[PDB]
Design a protein around this ligand. Structure first.
Ligand SMILES: CN1C(=O)c2ccccc2NC(=O)[C@@]12O[C@H]2c1ccccc1
Ligand SMILES: O=C(O)CCC(=O)C(=O)O
Ligand SMILES: [Fe+3]
Length: 288
């Protein structure tokens, strides 16, 4: 069984996207420092606790796919400083994304979410991402460059026993799905702050939590070309929060215009030839 390639965020930076493009998965060791992990966890903790089941009856966009033992919290910018400052500005994240998406243009956050799995959470079925949100992706030519990638960052230990993610290496290029089986998977064993990076075509699943004891938590960052609509909205984020971010983080959250890679690109989310941020006179890097 070939295992998932493991790479250093600092020392092997230029190899990360090529490794994923080839094998469909890679593990980025120390993607986030333990201190960032700590702060993020502390900041999102109470929002995770009050989050109801994915399909809650009070929701008008219930998630019917995720297990009732899963809690998912997105739109993290208003609730986490570590997320909106450190994570959205990660140099490692942006080098990988610009490596990946140069053919298309700008990229942004399709979804940044904290997912927590209760003890005895069952394994997910093997799947590709984006199929419950972007049916357009299924109509792309089989060899089109990936239009989104997913960083699954461990916020607690990933072990075989506690349900570490399964991936099928090379499955991002599969056209024929008859060999799909758990027998074809390897695991993503990870320390907190390590990240599993996959594309939108990589076949993977969350694993079964078999201890009955441990609570596994992750930060999933789906980065995608700016030509695709995010799964989440930042439209309700307070203006003072948005104006405390970097221009780059503002763009990632849909608070800036966007560009394609067409040589004579006419742009996305523009206003009569001017950007959102020029039109609104949007401040940046202003501490609250
Ligand atoms: C239901 N959905 C998610 O909610 C989700 C969660 C985090 C990040 C992305 C994301 N989008 C997905 O496409 C999908 O995970 C796919 C899935 C398929 C089968 C079982 C469980 C999940
Ligand atoms: O739980 C995991 O490790 C993977 C979660 C996942 O793949 C999803 O919800 O789409
Ligand atoms: Fe998934």
């Amino acid at each position: 069984k070939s295992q998932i390639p493991r790479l250093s965020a600092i020392n092997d930076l230029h190899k990360i996207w090529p490794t994923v493009e080839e094998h469909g998965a890679a593990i980025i060791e120390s993607f986030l420092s333990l201190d960032i992990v700590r702060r993020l966890n502390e900041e999102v903790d109470p929002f995770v606790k009050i989050e109801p089941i994915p399909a809650a009856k009070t929701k008008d966009h219930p998630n019917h796919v995720l297990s009732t033992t899963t809690r998912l919290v997105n739109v993290l910018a208003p609730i986490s400083k570590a997320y909106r400052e450190d994570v959205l500005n990660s140099k490692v994240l942006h080098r990988i994304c610009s490596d990946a998406f140069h053919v298309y243009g700008d990229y942004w956050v399709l979804m940044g979410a904290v997912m927590e799995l209760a003890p005895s959470n069952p394994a997910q079925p093997l799947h590709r991402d984006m199929r419950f949100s972007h049916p357009i992706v299924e109509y792309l030519k089989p060899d089109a460059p990936a239009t989104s990638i997913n960083f699954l960052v461990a916020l607690s230990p990933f072990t075989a026993e506690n349900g570490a993610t399964h991936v099928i290496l090379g499955s991002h290029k599969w056209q024929n799905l008859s060999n799909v089986s758990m027998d074809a998977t390897v695991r993503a064993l990870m320390n907190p702050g390590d990240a599993l990076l996959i594309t939108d075509s990589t076949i993977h699943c969350g694993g079964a939590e078999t201890t009955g004891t441990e609570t596994r938590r992750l930060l999933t960052i789906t980065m995608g070309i700016s030509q695709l609509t995010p799964l989440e909205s930042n439209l309700a984020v307070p203006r003072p929060v948005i104006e405390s971010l970097t221009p780059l983080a503002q763009r990632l959250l849909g608070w800036a215009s966007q560009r394609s890679a067409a040589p004579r690109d006419i742009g996305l989310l523009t206003i009569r030839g001017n950007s959102i941020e020029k039109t609104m006179n949007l401040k940046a890097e202003q501490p609250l």
